[PDB]
Nucleic acid binder design. Structure first.
Lengths: 79, 96, 283, 91, 68, 77, 92
DNA sequence: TGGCCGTTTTCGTTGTTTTTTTCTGTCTCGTGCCTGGTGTCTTGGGTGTAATCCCCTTGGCGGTTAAAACGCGGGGGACAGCGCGTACGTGCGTTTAAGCGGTGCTAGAGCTGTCTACGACCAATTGAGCGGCCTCGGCACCGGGATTCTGAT
């Protein structure tokens, strides 16, 4: 049940950075679902790369490749 | 004399054109537009027939999809009429 | 006996996954248990981890007279309980008629060549006739109403429904003593449902699971497994213990032939289909 | 000359729908499709091999690429067919 | 967040380990994604002449993005 | 030439897009949008044409432009 | 344990454009990510170009066309200017 | 004239910016090595160039008809205003677990060595696949009756 670790005030802070001034009570649970889906998709691909490499350790590069192939290129974690 | 109420014929047209697949923009003006736009990139160009048809299929598919999203934006604002701001919201969220 | 899938829920499988297994048609821990991982994974809303938890916790938890004397002699006294016997023959040879008769003869005393058990008729072809069961019951002096009471009936509409009724049959066959399980036009739904050619492997897999369930029920309940096949299969041969070839003699009298049996000779016996019964040939 | 998948698409079509034909435009779309999926899978396999400092693309790279590119049931069935085909081929 | 990542990853393959920077990479990606989503969501709320974001705003934003 | 993409044509496109009612200002807006789209695609297409040292834009030039803009088109290979 | 990167070249460029400015390790990592990303985009497009035209060689022409396809407007023009100048100077 | 209602001031508050001092760890430089890049020479094949041919793009004419343009009436939908009630923002006291710092161990990433299976390469063969030609049947166009559906009553 760790998705609940994505707290209401954390989601509020993320929304604030996104420019949001007011937030419906139902947003938080909604956000959690969305986040979980996103995470699942990334991690699935990442783990796939890890498994292809016959490793037991997910590397930063595994994640970077997953993100890249999902059209969400991330800078800063190569090498 | 008979007259359909506002909306009835619109809906009829929606069903009609969602049922079919024919291109909806006229051939010759589209071609004219394509050649005009192309001229500002490269001189002396010619076009394969299928190249212009390719551009038209792509353009019309793009516009239809954009109108779908635009419609969703209009309905979101509790309207049934699409407006420029609907298009602009759709294009902003698409990353255009 | 059975191990209803309810007990799997106390092992710590979540209840939603048990509902998904029942939707798939698995209603016992026995059902989940003797299957590989992939069966549970293909079910909607089931991951590989839940399938591994299910299999692990499941592994923690887990002669009937034909009433034709000539056929009984051909079979050495009647169907052996605990095994599948296939009778392949042309249409109208009496497969359905023999099934209706057996649905009652199974209820006959063992001293009369029966199994002293109730019958199960799963129909796929519409040929189920309670009146035929009543006629056979009054022929052998069995209660026709009790035959229908000793026959739980449901028409399988497709191969999936055909296999799913065995799960209901498996749970239902525990509550009452049965001796006969009938699947009429058992191969017809695999041709009508799976009518395409690329889907042949799919009907073969579904049929394989269906046959395994039939054999399982036979060994569990000591019941006779009777399936009727229209030949417009060799897979049943390894599964079926005795292959009987049926052909029509004119009038209502049928010719029976053994065309494969590892134990019974290829041989023939004559019998008839009478309003009351499937009954000895009277030329 | 100028290659396409047309004859193979037609053979498959005859397998799944014996009495069904296909228009020229539809065949063009099927050819576009096959080339597209070829490129996606081959490209991902290429990257898989590169990431792991391997110079050979094997069936394992193809399989992993399929798992990455195809959704759910399509991925499972495709993996099944590829594996089956390689097994039938090997002997 | 780390616990979230490990729980989810473990439901794909058991006994996995993580490089520290892998989890940090995942967090950067997730937060950037959510912040952008909240920008679009906010635009949808404002479009409907509201100042309060609601689930339907999120759903519209994601539908137009092609996520749904 | 952009005015050659007429109001009833844009209406037909919107109908296929499921639109029931349409503001008068849509048409001009649509034209601007169309122009931008066309420009981008054509700019890339011609680039391909020029690389091949040709004076004729081919269907493949267009297909490659569309593909590289994430708008894959089937049917013109 | 030898790991190559673009760090020293990025740093040399940095000293060219902002002589008294430094850069954090994280920022340098983002710059390295950037260079590798653009490398991949350009090389990949060039590969596709050579393939489309039945050429077995990627030349500066393929690089240039790829640059024109991938880069926006003035950025593309400026990049093309730099590459062309570099190739002509190299040739001499 | 006296009493109200509106606005601007201010003082108290208060978050946040600014500006200075201590520290600290991470960045900027050195140096040793080693392996990847540069000079030189070779072959060979891919690309550049030139001629050819033909197809397919461009341009023009004419008609004709369906679609676009335009006018107009009206209705319904956009939009502004208003009321309300409730859900959300703000603040405060409590509690909860995130964070940080140390320590410990073992799983597993990563590197090296060896060798054998496996894929590149190459020559001869040939049969699958492609271009071209022909034909017939699926589909399209036409037309006319049936059914549906819409709007006024």
């Amino acid at each position: 049940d760790n998705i609940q670790g994505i707290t209401k005030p954390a989601i509020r802070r993320l929304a604030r950075r996104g420019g949001v001034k007011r937030i419906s009570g139902l947003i938080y649970e909604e956000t959690r679902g969305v986040l979980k889906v996103f995470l699942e998709n990334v991690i699935r691909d990442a783990v796939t790369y890890t498994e292809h490499a016959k490793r037991k350790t997910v590397t930063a590069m595994d994640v970077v490749y997953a993100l890249k192939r999902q059209g969400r290129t991330l800078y800063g974690f190569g090498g | 004399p008979h007259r359909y109420r506002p909306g009835t014929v619109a809906l009829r047209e929606i069903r009609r054109y969602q049922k079919s697949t024919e291109l909806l923009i006229r051939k010759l003006p589209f071609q004219r537009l394509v050649r005009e736009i192309a001229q500002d990139f490269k001189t002396d160009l010619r076009f394969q027939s299928s190249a212009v048809m390719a551009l038209q299929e792509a353009c019309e598919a793009y516009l239809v999809g954009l109108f779908e999203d635009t419609n969703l934006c209009a309905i979101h604002a509790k309207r049934v009429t699409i407006m420029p701001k609907d298009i602009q919201l759709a294009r902003r969220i698409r990353g255009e | 006996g059975p191990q209803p899938i309810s007990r799997l829920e106390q092992c710590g499988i979540n209840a939603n996954d048990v509902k998904k297994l029942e939707e798939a048609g698995f209603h016992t821990v026995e059902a989940v248990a003797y299957a590989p991982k992939k069966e549970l994974i293909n079910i909607k809303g089931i991951s590989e981890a839940k399938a591994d938890k299910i299999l692990a916790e499941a592994a923690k938890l887990v002669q009937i007279t034909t009433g034709s004397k000539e056929l009984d002699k051909l079979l050495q006294g009647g169907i052996e309980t605990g095994s599948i016997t296939e009778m392949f023959g042309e249409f109208r040879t009496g497969k359905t008629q023999i099934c209706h008769t057996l649905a009652v003869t199974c209820q006959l005393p063992i001293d009369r060549g029966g199994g002293e058990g109730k019958a199960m008729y799963i129909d796929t072809e519409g040929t189920f006739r309670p009146e035929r069961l009543l006629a056979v019951a009054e022929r052998y002096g069995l209660s026709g109403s009790d035959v229908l009471d000793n026959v739980a009936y449901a028409r399988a509409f497709n191969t999936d429904h055909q296999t799913q009724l065995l799960y209901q049959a498996s749970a239902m066959m525990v509550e009452s003593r049965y001796a006969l399980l009938i699947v009429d036009s058992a191969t017809a739904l695999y041709r009508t449902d799976y009518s395409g050619r690329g889907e042949l492997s799919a009907r073969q897999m579904h049929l394989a699971r269906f046959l395994r369930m039939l054999l399982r029920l036979a060994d569990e309940f000591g019941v006779a497994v009777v399936i009727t096949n229209q030949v417009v299969g060799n897979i049943i041969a390894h599964a079926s213990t005795t292959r009987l070839y049926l052909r029509k003699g004119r009038g209502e009298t049928r010719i029976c032939k053994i065309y494969d049996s590892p134990c019974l000779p290829e041989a023939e016996a004559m019998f008839a289909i009478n309003a009351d019964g499937v009954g000895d040939a009277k030329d | 000359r100028k290659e396409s998948y047309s004859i193979y698409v037609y053979k498959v079509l005859k397998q799944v729908h014996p009495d069904t034909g296909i228009s020229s435009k539809a065949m063009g779309i099927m050819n576009s499709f096959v080339n597209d999926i070829f490129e996606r899978i081959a490209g991902e396999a290429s990257r898989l091999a590169h990431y792991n400092k391997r110079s050979t693309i094997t069936s394992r790279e193809i399989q992993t690429a399929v798992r990455l590119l195809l959704p759910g049931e399509l991925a499972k069935h495709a993996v099944s067919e590829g594996t089956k085909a390689v097994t039938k081929y090997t002997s | 967040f780390q616990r979230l990542v490990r729980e989810i990853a473990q439901d794909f393959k058991t006994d996995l380990r993580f490089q520290s920077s892998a989890v940090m990479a995942l967090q950067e990606a997730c937060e950037a994604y959510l912040v952008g989503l909240f920008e679009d969501t906010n635009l949808c709320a404002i479009h409907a002449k509201r100042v309060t974001i609601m689930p339907k705003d999120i759903q519209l934003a994601r539908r137009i993005r092609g996520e749904r």
